[PDB]
Ligand binder design. Structure first.
Ligand SMILES: [Mg+2]
Lengths: 22, 452, 69, 104, 50, 1340
């Protein structure tokens, strides 16, 4: 998404909603 | 403890403890009276409920305090507090030797100090004043020293001048974010009830002048004085801890000052003449002969420390303006003339200070910054900058742009009436044409406003 | 994650600050957990010198004096 | 019991003295000395929860505003510690037997 | 809205244009006033972590 | 033109003719309470309503009934003034007739005895002032109107966030005015659920069972019918040809020897039309089609009498056979379509654990009050008591109306309870929504938002009181004897009084009126709050409601709301708005019939406005007012676009009505960004009144309406000539046309003089009229604080230059000249109420005596012999206002102290000094003193002086009344006698007292003489009784609290001017804080040599977008230009022609505007005064969205002599040299908010401490120190400063040893600390250890 919530999500390590797989 | 009107007020823990004691004693009684099981059991349940209510209330029935609906606070709640997550060192604690008030400007200040109201400094340093007063013998005893300062006798102001001198105070603003939210300054006694805060620091505090209030704290112990001076001191943090870039960068009035100083017009008084140096350039300007900004060749002497820890001198004819020439008098030593020969925007005016720091060190950067602020304000005042209603120029082509862009919408509208375009795609189209129109008018007014 | 990593702390005086106090004190009390301070929050709470800063000299000097002769 | 009686008289006379009966009236109703109303009326009141929330719903609650009046101010303590020095100096000034007699 | 404000501050805005500007204004104030709190929360989490 | 308009006229720019003039700005407040307190013969809300609601109370089958007859409100004990000074509540006694009847056992009814106890008195109820305010404790208080969800039914979505399958859900909510909530909601499985309040969810059908519906009629209710005939053998069906829509053929669809549809072919509109026109009633179907169909009713075998199938059971090919051979021709089934008509209720039933009515009632009762054994009578009682009882449930009128209307009913009024039809209909509607026909409502819509007001809420509280007294009356009627008790005996005072006193005293919506300002009051009184009782919390919602709705248009101000923790949870009422008949919000419009725009006004509610197309406030029409453009910008449904010439239904009345009275005072608002405008109208209410009310130089034209409609001014009740004008009072002689026949002649207005306001500011009225002047009815006879000549002056306009000055205006900081502080124009007057309390301690009573231990003659001087300060004596901090001494016996002194007393021989007192002294730093003059005494304690010397003084002053006042009144009356009799008895010189010889004897010839004039006789005598005795009453109100010992013997209230009036740190702001949302006060010498001046008052910062203008402040500056300058020209021409002394010509020229201005003007007004005595008032500057008006234009401003500047640019050359007052570039200078109206720096400024070294945890606590107006928080600690942590922090949280604060042990070192000249442990943590150890937890301190 973006913004301050993006920062929070990053620092919280939260898995995104529709992630890829490696 | 008692109150006014002979009334009493007490903690709820007394209600709870009382309950526990009464039910326990009653249980002892019911045991000694040989009561049926059904009764003594009920007494045991009630006692368990009472003890539970006393320790942590709310994990059973939530007992209510006497005559009052509100649930009585228990020992667990005594520990917990609330608004957190806040354990009373955490949320905050009231502190002696401190105060606060509305803040004002004080541009005359060096950045190492701050205006402190007379009365405030009197009330804040009170014990120090007492001790000093009787240290010299102006007061027979501490009692008498109070009565002196309470009289506000004429002598004590001179003593306060003494206790203030080397003894820094801590200034803090409300939303403390980074560590620079608290800074230490040197108190300067001031008539009035308002605190005077150095302009260059207004950046770090995020403090505007619209009625923001600041708080003062006195570093009592010696270690706190030296901590305030060698750590929390204003001059010792000139740079953001987030990035090495200077936080003491000049803000607004000052940058309009240096910008108006160093900028060149195409023609004015003094265009194309030659001068021995910055001295007679300023001397030329102040007397009205040469315009602040005019293209001029002047002899200047720059320095470079590019030898080994040693300053090299060199002089030349520089093609510059009278303004740049005047300003160069402020630039210390090793910095090149190149730095002041540009237009000096808020960005460049910062890189000047940064380079000055990483070259000449702390002290020169400090005094430099001070001078930059002073000259900035002064020349900004001389500049007679203002804002009128005609200062904002609307593009002469605006109405026409509006018209054409307005014709687009009706083209697409006719297309929708004719079914050529669907509803949604249509919406996107009209939104796009107007969105383009906005950019058109913007990039019209900017050309007109900028170069015209 | 940060909010999770904050949860891990050896000092129970510190944990009882920003975490749920009621649970922290119990959960520590059963294990007979012995808090040595060390960290900042606990030292602020107990009202002694910060083990950072000017305080580092003290705490270090003491920390070494501890578990020693 | 007395307090209860006192609460009744006001029921007879509340609308009867279409305000409330003066604090001194129930006194004459009752059998006893009649200034005792104020005392009794005062003693019978229950204390207020020290946790009683005061304004803003904020964590300021009533008990937080109760100052310690039993503590002695530092400003005075200093002067006491100074009085010790003053008198000590002064009794050090007299003759040691006069100083002994006065200290005694 | 597909009809942008065709007037600026130097010229006068009319009733509609202003009424429509209002929502943007209030959302601005509310949002910023909230992002204060969010920022604070973030700093808190951060210093607690370190 | 009115009479104060001849004094001064505002030149009004702006085009739009005002079709509707601004109404009473206090409308809501007054009308509401006027409805609460009133006698309404029937049920419309009032005291009558609540009375009728709870009454008549009857005992429990004891046939003892207490009915209510009628009520009255006694005259107020103290009128507003006396009530204010004394501090008592302004209230009326409530006298209510109660009739207690007993029914002889046994009946046919009728009656042993009914006792009619004359009106029992319950409490006194507060009264609302003429201004819409209440006085509770001697203080004006306002109750804010409320905004909540209207009672009725409400259909919502909650799509999205729930369940992440999309799908939404649909829910209905029945919200009563009072009583339990009834909620209906779906789930992902599409099972309909019901919950009472927020409680445990239950399958919907379970409620229908409790209404006595079996399964059969539930199915009958929500489902259609499908008829299955077994006729001959094997399976026909009744086919309604529309049923086949939205489905595919499952088999061969055929009949009538003609095949209509083949299997595998979706039935479309073609097949349907075919079948319809060919009228196929009956079609043969296979036996496998009923394999899935759900049977409607119960089916039994006639022979065996056994149940073949229960209702709502899925039939099978075998079940078909089993009920077929039993002789069943017909089988009814549900009509179920997974698209059109949903099979919800059926499945809901399949989740229903219950069977019969009582089976459901058990589950409902066990839901509401779980854990305890259910009972039949209990279940029935509870359930019937919930939504079906006249007691515990009401939707009221608004509720029943919105309910029915939302249900598409006819009746707009009905029962206040729920009916089976109601619940069932609501369910039907919800199912219809889930099925696709119908839409969900939205909460934020102002049609779903209802406005309450003081009346409604006061009524609710009084109602609560009545239920709680009802319980008591029934409780007493239980055991009652027959002919002894009557109503008073059961019915008390205290309950009712306490309910009402609780409302007005403590509630979020009852607050102290915000009176620092005439705008503040009037903008407080129009206000909306969604908070408080029955509202949301800031913590809960949430952005949608806060946001400005399209429905806010014309109803609520978009741009005036608070900028705090609650935004949009308040707002404000708009200018032209009003409370709807049902309590919604409606705004004035203009009905366009045919093509003409009619000036007839029409009010439309939120929903009424919906489908219509409303035109625009600014739209060009001419002559007749037919629309000039072929298409005009309009808004129809929720949106706005261009609309065809006549499609238009309505048009905005005014170019104002969008905004409020706060924003309507902002000049050039159209040029200001909404944020800064908000801030502007927000701060404008914070302006403290100045010493000299100026007036705006730049205005709107609303300031007049604000000043007058707010009670601050004095408006003439009746027009006439002023007999007498005094700073104290004003006596106006009434005209005969306005005047009533009897009692004769004059209105006397007693002006309010210097007195304490709520904000500790001053409120003082000054006469705006002159001796022997004509006054029109409804004209200002006086000005309140901060009002000038009937307009509103919140501050002062001044000469301001935009230019950076030496950094002294660095951010917003304001740089003001010395001329301003010297002219004392921004000076402000404060009124502080200080009190001294003489209490009773066990040691003894406290004395107010002037005998004070340890004070010099200089200290006791300022007090009289009794111990109270003299009136008028100026005082500063530390001065003794009231001497007070309290017993403390037996010091328990120690060693050397003793020794000391032995040397110096002092009798150190048994009495401590409690005297009230002026707070530190505040300095003012005593304007008044009051003394309250317990009724029965001896009045002290001074208080007695005061009482005699007030008594004599009172007699003088009353005497004045009777004299002016009598003279006024006899002066009429004199005129009536000359009317067919005329004796001139003869009549006025003999004593006036002996006039009434002389009559007149037969005529009505004799009867007029009679009238004047009657009323004369009436006034004559009225005087007597009034003086007696006043004397008593003076002499009565005020009723005090327990423990307090006497109270002395001193009133100080401090005078503060302006100093650096004070907050100042324009109306445009531009703040500032004065920095330095600069000499006139250093002020930038122009070529004319006139300095400038204030130097602003031009850097503040571009960023914050408010360009309105600049336009205001320019136009203000121009106005001051016209003013200056007039001053020069008056100083000329020209004569009338030159002047008048110029003034007119000023008023004409270019063409196209609406103002008009003279030469009506008298060409000499009037015009000259107009000019005289106009020379200070020419007051203009800039209507809000209709305001002036650049061209008009420049044109007016041409009428000046001053430049178009608005900028001129300025010279530094220091160097005398010019300033490069011109700088904008003009006149900007500026407000001094009260953030005064000698309020804000605080300092502490060592103060009082808190007992519970030892921490710094200000108790003395000696301040608790600054709170050092967590972030502030982190700041110290990032720096390396450990010691600063330790001393911060140990010695400076929490350490009880540390603080003092430190202090001694501070004075000793040693800076150290011996910190120890903070008391907080030390307490926490005891608190932790108090539990079963052992917390120790290990080791060493
Ligand atoms: Mg600010």
């Amino acid at each position: 998404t973006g913004g301050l919530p993006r920062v929070a999500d990053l620092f919280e390590a939260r898995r995104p909603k529709e992630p890829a797989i490696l | 403890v008692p109150l006014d009107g002979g009334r009493f007020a007490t903690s709820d823990l007394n209600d709870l403890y009382r309950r526990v004691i009464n039910r326990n004693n009653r249980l002892k009684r019911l045991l000694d009276l040989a009561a049926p099981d059904i009764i003594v059991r009920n007494e045991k349940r009630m006692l368990q409920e009472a003890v539970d209510a006393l320790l942590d209330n709310g994990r059973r029935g939530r007992a209510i305090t006497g005559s009052n609906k509100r649930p009585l606070k228990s020992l667990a709640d005594m520990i917990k507090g609330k608004q957190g997550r806040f354990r009373q060192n955490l949320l905050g604690k009231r502190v002696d030797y401190s105060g606060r008030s509305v803040i004002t400007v004080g541009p005359y200040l060096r950045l190492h100090q701050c205006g402190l109201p007379k009365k405030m400094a009197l009330e804040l340093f009170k014990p120090f004043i007492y001790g000093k007063l009787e240290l010299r013998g102006l007061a027979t005893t501490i009692k008498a020293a109070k009565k002196m300062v309470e009289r506000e006798e004429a002598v004590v102001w001179d003593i306060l001048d003494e206790v203030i001198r080397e003894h820094p105070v801590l200034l803090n603003r409300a939303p403390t974010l980074h560590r620079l939210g608290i800074q230490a300054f040197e108190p300067v006694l001031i008539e009035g009830k308002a605190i005077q805060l150095h302009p260059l620091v207004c950046a770090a505090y995020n403090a505007d002048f619209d009625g923001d209030q600041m708080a003062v704290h006195v570093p009592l112990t010696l270690e706190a004085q030296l901590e305030a001076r060698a750590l929390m001191m204003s001059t010792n943090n000139i740079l953001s801890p987030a990035n090495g870039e200077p936080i003491i960068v000049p803000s607004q009035d000052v940058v309009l000052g240096l910008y108006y100083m160093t900028r060149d017009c195409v023609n004015a008084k003094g265009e194309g003449m030659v001068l021995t140096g910055p001295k007679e350039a300023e001397r030329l300007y102040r007397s009205g002969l040469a315009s602040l900004h005019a293209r001029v060749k002047v002899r200047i002497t720059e320095y470079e420390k590019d030898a080994n820890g040693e300053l090299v001198a060199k002089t030349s004819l520089k093609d510059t303006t009278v303004g740049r020439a005047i300003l160069w008098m402020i630039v210390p030593k090793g910095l090149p003339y190149s730095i002041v020969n540009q237009a000096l925007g808020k960005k460049a005016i910062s890189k000047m200070l940064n380079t000055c720091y990483r070259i000449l060190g702390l002290k020169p950067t400090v005094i430099f910054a001070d001078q930059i602020m002073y000259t900035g304000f002064a020349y900004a005042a001389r500049s007679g900058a203002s804002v009128g209603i005609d200062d904002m120029v609307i593009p002469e082509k605006k109405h026409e742009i509006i018209s054409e862009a307005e014709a687009e919408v009706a083209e697409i509208q006719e297309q929708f009436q004719s079914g050529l375009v669907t509803a949604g795609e249509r919406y996107n189209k009209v939104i796009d044409i107007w969105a383009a129109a906005n950019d058109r008018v913007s990039k019209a007014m900017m050309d007109n406003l900028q170069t015209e | 994650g940060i909010t999770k990593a904050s949860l891990a702390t050896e000092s129970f005086i510190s944990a009882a600050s920003f975490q749920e106090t009621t649970r922290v004190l119990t959960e520590a009390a059963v294990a007979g957990k012995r808090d040595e301070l060390r960290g900042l929050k606990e030292n602020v709470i107990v009202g002694r010198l910060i083990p950072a800063g000017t305080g580092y000299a003290y705490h270090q000097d003491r920390m070494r004096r501890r578990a020693a002769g | 019991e007395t307090i209860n009686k006192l609460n009744r008289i006001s029921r007879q006379m509340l609308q009867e003295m279409g305000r409330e009966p003066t604090p001194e009236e129930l006194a004459e109703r009752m059998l006893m000395p009649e200034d005792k109303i104020r005392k009794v009326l005062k003693i019978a009141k229950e204390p207020i929860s020290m946790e009683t929330p005061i304004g803003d719903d904020e964590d300021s609650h009533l008990g937080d505003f109760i100052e310690d009046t039993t503590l002695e101010l530092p400003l005075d303590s200093a002067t006491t510690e100074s009085l010790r020095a003053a008198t000590h100096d002064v009794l050090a000034g007299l003759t040691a037997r006069e100083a002994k007699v006065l200290r005694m | 809205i597909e009809t942008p404000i065709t007037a600026n501050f130097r010229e006068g805005l009319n009733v509609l244009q202003y009424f429509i500007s209002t929502h943007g204004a209030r959302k601005g104030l509310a949002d910023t006033a909230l992002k204060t709190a969010n920022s604070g929360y973030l700093t808190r989490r951060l210093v607690d972590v370190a | 033109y009115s009479y104060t308009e001849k004094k001064r006229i505002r030149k009004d720019f702006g085009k739009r003719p005002q079709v509707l003039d601004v109404p009473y700005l206090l409308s809501i407040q007054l009308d509401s309470f006027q409805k609460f307190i009133e006698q309404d013969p029937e049920g419309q809300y009032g005291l009558e309503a609540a009375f009728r609601s709870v009454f008549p109370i009857q005992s429990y089958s004891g046939n003892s009934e207490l009915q209510y007859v009628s009520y009255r409100l006694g005259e107020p004990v103290f009128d507003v003034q006396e009530c204010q000074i004394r501090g008592v509540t302004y209230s009326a006694p409530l006298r209510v007739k109660l009739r207690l009847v007993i029914y002889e056992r046994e009946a046919p009814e009728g009656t042993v005895k009914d006792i009619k106890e004359q009106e029992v008195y319950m409490g006194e109820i507060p009264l609302m002032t003429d201004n819409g305010t209440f006085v509770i404790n001697g203080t004006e208080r306002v109750i804010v109107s409320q905004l909540h969800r209207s009672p009725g039914v409400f259909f919502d979505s909650d799509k999205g966030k729930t369940h992440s399958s999309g799908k939404v859900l649909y829910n209905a909510r029945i919200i009563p005015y009072r009583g339990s909530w009834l909620d209906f909601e779906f789930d992902p499985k599409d099972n309909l659920f019901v919950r009472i309040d927020r409680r445990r969810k239950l399958p919907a059908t379970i409620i229908l069972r409790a209404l006595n519906y079996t399964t059969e009629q539930i199915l009958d209710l929500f489902f259609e019918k499908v008829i299955f005939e077994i006729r001959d053998n094997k399976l026909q069906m009744e086919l309604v040809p529309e049923r086949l829509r939205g489905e595919t053929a499952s088999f061969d669809i055929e009949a009538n020897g003609k095949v209509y549809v083949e299997k595998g072919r979706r039935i479309t509109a073609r097949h349907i039309r075919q079948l319809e026109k060919d009228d196929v009633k009956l079609i043969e179907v296979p036996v496998e089609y009923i394999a899935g169909k759900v049977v409607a009713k119960d089916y039994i075998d006639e022979s065996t009498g056994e149940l073949i199938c229960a209702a709502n059971m899925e039939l099978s090919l075998d079940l078909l056979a089993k009920l077929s051979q039993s002789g069943h021709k017909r089988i009814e089934t549900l009509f179920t379509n997974d698209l059109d008509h949903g099979p919800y209720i059926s499945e809901t039933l399949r989740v229903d654990p219950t069977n019969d009515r009582l089976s459901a009632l058990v589950e409902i009762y066990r839901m509401m009050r779980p854990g305890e054994p259910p009972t039949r009578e209990a279940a029935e009682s509870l359930f019937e008591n919930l939504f079906f009882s006249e007691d515990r449930y009401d939707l009221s009128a608004v509720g029943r109306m919105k309910f029915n209307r939302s249900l598409l009913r006819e009746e707009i009024e009905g029962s206040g309870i729920l009916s089976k039809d109601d619940i069932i209909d609501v369910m039907k509607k919800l199912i219809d929504i889930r099925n696709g026909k119908g839409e969900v409502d939205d909460i934020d819509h102002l049609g779903n938002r209802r406005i309450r007001s003081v009346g409604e809420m006061a009524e609710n509280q009084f109602r609560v009181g009545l239920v709680r007294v009802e319980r008591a009356v029934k409780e007493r009627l239980s055991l009652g004897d027959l002919d002894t008790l009557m109503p008073q005996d059961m019915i008390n005072a205290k309950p009712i009084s306490a309910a009402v006193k609780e409302f007005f005293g403590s509630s979020q919506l009852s607050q102290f009126m915000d009176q620092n300002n005439p705008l503040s009051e009037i903008t407080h009184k129009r206000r909306i709050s969604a908070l408080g009782p029955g509202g949301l919390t800031r913590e809960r919602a949430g952005f949608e409601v806060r946001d400005v709705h399209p429905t806010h248009y014309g109803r609520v101000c978009p741009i005036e709301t608070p900028e705090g923790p609650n935004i949009g949870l308040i707002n404000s009422l708009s200018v032209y708005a009003q409370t709807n008949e049902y309590g919604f919000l409606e705004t004035p419009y203009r009905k366009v019939t045919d093509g003409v725009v009619t000036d007839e006004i029409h009010y439309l509610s939120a929903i009424e406005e919906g489908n219509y197309v409303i035109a625009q406030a600014n739209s060009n029409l001419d002559e007749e007012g037919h629309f000039v453009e072929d298409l005009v910008t309009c808004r129809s449904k929720g949106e706005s676009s261009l609309f065809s010439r006549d499609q238009v239904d309505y048009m905005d009345v005014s170019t104002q009505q969008v905004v409020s009275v706060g924003a309507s005072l902002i000049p050039f608002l159209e040029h200001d960004d909404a944020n800064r405008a908000l801030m502007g109208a927000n701060m404008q209410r914070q302006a403290v009144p100045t010493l000299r009310a100026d007036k705006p130089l730049v205005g709107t034209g609303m300031e007049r309406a604000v000043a007058v409609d707010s009670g601050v001014t004095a408006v003439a009740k009746r027009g006439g000539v002023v007999q007498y004008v005094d700073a104290s009072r004003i006596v106006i002689k009434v005209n005969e046309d306005e005047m009533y026949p009897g009692e004769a002649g004059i209105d006397i207005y007693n002006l309010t003089k210097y007195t304490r306001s709520n904000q500790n500011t001053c409120i003082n009225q000054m006469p705006c009229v002159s001796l022997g002047e004509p006054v029109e009815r409804g004209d200002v006879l006086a000005d309140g604080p901060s009002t000038d000549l009937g307009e509103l002056a919140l501050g002062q306009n001044m000469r301001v230059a935009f230019m950076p000055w030496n950094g002294y205006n660095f951010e917003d900081s304001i740089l003001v000249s010395e001329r301003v502080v010297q002219e004392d124009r921004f000076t402000t007057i404060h009124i502080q109420e200080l009190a001294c309390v003489s209490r009773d301690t066990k040691l003894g009573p406290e004395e107010i005596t002037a005998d004070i231990p340890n004070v010099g003659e200089a200290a006791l001087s300022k007090l009289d012999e009794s111990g109270i300060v003299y009136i008028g004596a100026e005082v500063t901090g530390g001065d003794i206002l009231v001497g007070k001494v309290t017993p403390k016996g037996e010091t328990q002194l120690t060693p050397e102290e003793k020794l000391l007393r032995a040397i110096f021989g002092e009798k150190a007192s048994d009495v401590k000094d409690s005297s009230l002294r002026v707070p530190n730093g505040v300095s003012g003059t005593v304007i008044d003193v009051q003394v309250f005494t317990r009724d029965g304690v001896e009045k002290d010397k001074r208080a007695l002086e005061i009482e005699e003084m007030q008594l004599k002053q009172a007699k003088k006042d009353l005497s004045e009344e009777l004299q002016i009144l009598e003279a006024g009356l006899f002066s009429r009799i004199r005129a009536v006698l000359v009317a067919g008895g005329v004796e001139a010189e003869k009549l006025d010889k003999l004593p006036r007292d002996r006039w009434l004897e002389l009559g007149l010839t037969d005529e009505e004039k004799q009867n007029q003489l009679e009238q004047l006789a009657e009323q004369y005598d009436e006034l004559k005795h009225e005087f007597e009784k009034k003086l007696e009453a006043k004397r008593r109100k003076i002499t009565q010992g005020d009723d005090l609290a327990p423990g307090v013997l006497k109270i002395v209230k001193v009133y100080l009036a401090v005078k503060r001017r302006i100093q650096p740190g004070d907050k100042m702001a324009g109306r445009h949302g531009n703040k500032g804080v004065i920095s330095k006060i600069n000499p006139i010498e250093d002020m930038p001046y122009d070529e004319n040599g006139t300095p400038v008052d204030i130097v602003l910062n031009p850097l503040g203008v571009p960023s914050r977008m408010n360009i309105g402040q600049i336009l205001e500056t320019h136009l203000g300058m121009a106005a001051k230009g016209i003013g200056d020209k007039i001053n020069a021409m008056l100083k000329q002394q020209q004569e009338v022609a030159k002047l008048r010509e110029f003034i007119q020229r000023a008023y004409d201005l270019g063409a196209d505007v609406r103002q008009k003007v003279d030469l009506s007004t008298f060409s000499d005595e009037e015009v000259m005064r107009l000019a005289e008032n106009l020379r200070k500057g020419m007051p203009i008006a800039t209507p809000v969205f209709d305001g002036a234009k650049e061209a008009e401003i420049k044109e007016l500047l041409k009428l000046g002599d001053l430049p178009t640019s608005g900028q001129i050359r300025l010279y530094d007052g220091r160097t005398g040299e010019q300033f490069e570039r011109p700088v904008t200078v003009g006149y900007m109206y500026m407000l001094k908010l009260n953030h005064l720096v000698d309020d804000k400024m605080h300092a502490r070294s060592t103060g009082s401490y808190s007992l519970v945890t030892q921490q710094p606590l200000g108790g003395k107006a000696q301040f608790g120190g600054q709170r050092f928080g967590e972030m502030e600690v982190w700041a110290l942590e990032a720096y390396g400063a450990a010691y600063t922090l330790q001393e911060m949280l140990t010695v400076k604060s929490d350490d009880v040893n540390g603080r003092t042990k430190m202090y001694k070192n501070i004075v000793d000249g040693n800076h150290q600390m011996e910190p120890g442990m903070p008391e907080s943590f030390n307490v926490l150890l005891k608190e932790i250890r108090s539990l079963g937890i052992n917390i120790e301190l290990e080791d060493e």
